[PDB]
Chains A and B, each alone.
Chain A
Amino acid sequence: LREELQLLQEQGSYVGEVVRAMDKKKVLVKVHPEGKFVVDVDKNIDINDVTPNCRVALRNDSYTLHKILPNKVDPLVSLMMVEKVPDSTYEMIGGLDKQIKEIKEVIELPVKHPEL
């Protein structure tokens, strides 16, 4: 408990994500509400144990990395959620049974198996 206040008090923190990871032992991170910064790697997380577009934590005024958040973030993943895929099954829609066959062949078949 004694120790917790010392750990707890810190300059602050930031949340960025790795845009790119160099071969120069610096990592390119964009902190979310500010610009991009190029910073040296920490002990815990560096270039070999990171893959880009992995959200990573920073401890402020040094921007050294703490722990890797296992979740991935891209602009594309949020977009998908916001637009929202429908609930309605082809059955529900039906009476368009003649239509579900026609659409199926051109859209669905080449994405599922482009191999064929």
Chain B
Amino acid sequence: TQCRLKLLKLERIKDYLLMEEEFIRNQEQMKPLEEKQEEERSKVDDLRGTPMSVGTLEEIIDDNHAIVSTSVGSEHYVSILSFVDKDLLEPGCSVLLNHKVHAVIGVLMDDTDPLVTVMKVEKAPQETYADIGGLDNQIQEIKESVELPLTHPEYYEEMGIKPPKGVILYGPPGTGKTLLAKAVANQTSATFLRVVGSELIQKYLGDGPKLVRELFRVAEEHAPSIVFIDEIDAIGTKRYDSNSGGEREIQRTMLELLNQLDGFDSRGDVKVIMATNRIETLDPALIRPGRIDRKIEFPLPDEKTKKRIFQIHTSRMTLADDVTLDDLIMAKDDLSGADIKAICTEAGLMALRERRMKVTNEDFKKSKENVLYKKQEGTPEGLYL
């Protein structure tokens, strides 16, 4: 264990010291690096000069040429300049070209797009793990699928199965489906990428599947990852009729996500947690077992689970004896986690209307009515029961 650390260190000491030692010492003694080493530094620096046009490396061709498309409105099949390497130009990265005659001087920039910025979402949530009470079983299921192979893939790939991936979150909406992905994500310490399913279908024509590729590619590079795809239910439910891409757009997008997931691609370390309303309203192409090994159906939240969530919100809220938790929970029926959150947020807002910075039993009682109607409403149901 400790002994290993010494071996790894052994490669790295030699790498810094050798580069330092060789550059200065070898120009000084005989003719090894000497005239040649200056020559590479100088030639590239002069050719590059002022200005340099930026281009993007589309492809590399095996005959000391490359297909660069330049940001000047002209594409080029460049010739390599003496003392620059063809095979250090990544297809992920954009390259810099001398703008007088088109040859790759070098890569000072890899460049950046607003397209990257959508996939990468940083989370630092107000509610996280141990801010959720009750429905304890549901969290344990998620973890066996997502956390355990992601941390230690070695047995899971080794046994012979592909690693069990992901979970499908369906049942009564409002249980706290969104809190759960964000909370489990912190514990595992996986890079959390959030992207809406409806955002993938958009006006632009052919941009739609390209974006889905990027979403997967970026998740993979980041390394441990979970992709929480919020409101994926959206592609299926709606045939939008407001996109110029049309019905064509919806078709081509839907296939690409499947391809990127496993497919023939068979990318690993990328768990997808799918938030849906129901998976009976979800598109039948997307849904299919064996990409997602486990499906979890939340029960209707009971009176019991509800108390634990509220004690946390009471701790976050102004403290008084005028906070009456029990009364609000009791009155309500067997209904979502969301409501406990809604009663607390509407209660603070309500206070501002009064010209009071206090949240008392009066704000809560008023809040109980609005939250209950909006969410499902008990007076229809009371007849049928």
Contact = CB atoms under 8 A, between A and B. Distances in A.
B75 to A, nearest CB: 12
Interface string A40-83: 10000000000000000000001110000000000000000000
B44 interface: no
A26 B54 CA distance: 13
Contact of A35 (B49, B50, B54, B96): B54
Interface of A is mostly: mixed
Contacts of B51: 37-39, 62-63
A35 B108 contact: no
Interface range, B side: 10 to 19
Contacts of B99: 37
A58 to B, nearest CB: 9
Contacts of A24: 108
B357 A36 contact: no
Contacts of B73: 34-35
**B interface secondary structure, majority:** loop
A21 B76 CA distance: 27
A28 interface: yes
A116 B352 contact: yes
B71 A36 contact: yes
B139 to A, nearest CB: 31
Contacts of B353: 105
A116 B54 CA distance: 48
A106 interface: yes
B70 interface: yes
A35 B72 contact: yes
A39 B52 contact: yes
Interface residues of A, number: 18
A109 interface: yes
B325 to A, nearest CB: 23
Given A26-B108, A109-B352, A39 B53 contact: no
B101 interface: no
B54 A22 contact: no
Interface string B337-357: 000000000000100110001
A38 B48 CA distance: 10
Most chain A CB within a 10 A radius of its CB, from B51, B73, B349, B353: B51
B52 A38 contact: yes
B349 A37 contact: no
Contacts of A28: 54, 109
A38 B96 contact: yes
Contacts of B108: 22, 24, 26, 38
Interface in B104-159: 108-109
A39 B352 contact: no
Nearest to A24: B108
B349 A35 contact: no
A35 B49 CA distance: 17
B72 A34 contact: yes
Contacts of A40: 49-50
A106 B349 contact: yes
Contacts of B53: 35-37
B71 A39 contact: no
A116 B357 contact: yes
Contacts of A116: 352, 357
A105 to B, nearest CB: 6
Contacts of B349: 105-106
Contact of B70 (A22, A35, A39, A109): A35
A60 B126 CA distance: 52
A22 B49 CA distance: 16
Nearest to A110: B349
Most buried by B among A22, A39, A62: A39
A3 to B, nearest CB: 25
Contact of B54 (A38, A63, A64): A38
Contacts of A63: 50-51
B71 A35 contact: yes
Interface centre among B54, B73, B96, B357 (most CB of A within 10 A): B54
Contacts of A62: 50-51
A63 B52 CA distance: 10
A25 to B, nearest CB: 10
Per CB-CB distance, the 7 closest pairs between chain A and chain B, nearest first, are: A35-B71, A37-B51, A39-B51, A63-B51, A36-B54, A38-B52, A35-B72
Given A26-B108, A38-B108, A105-B349, 6 more contacts: A35-B53, A36-B53, A37-B54, A38-B54, A105-B352, A116-B352
9 contacts: A22-B108, A28-B54, A35-B70, A37-B53, A37-B54, A40-B50, A62-B50, A63-B50, A109-B352
